[PDB]
Amino acid sequence: DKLKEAETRAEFAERSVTKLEKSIDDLEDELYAQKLKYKAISEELDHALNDMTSI
């Protein structure tokens, strides 16, 4: 009896971990996409502040 209970709950904990792991990979990927989409606009920036201080 202790068994049916330990196993059923293990299955629910595993379903919840795979759900949360799937949501961590989407946020961490949406991420390097944001973190990188920036190095580009902040670098396009030191550049686009340097040429008008020069022109």
User: Which parts of this chain interact with its own copies (CB under 8 A)?
Assistant: 17-20, 52-55
| H/E segment holding residue 1 | none
Nearer to its own copies, 46 or 51 (CB): 51
Please say which residue, 1 or 26, places its beta carbon nearer to its own copies: 26
Minimum gap (Å) between residue 29 Cβ and its own copies: 20
Beta-strand ranges (E) seen in 1-55 are: none
Single-letter amino acid code for the residue at 9:
R
Nearer to its own copies, 16 or 18 (CB): 18
Residue 14 CA to residue 6 CA, distance in Å, equals 12
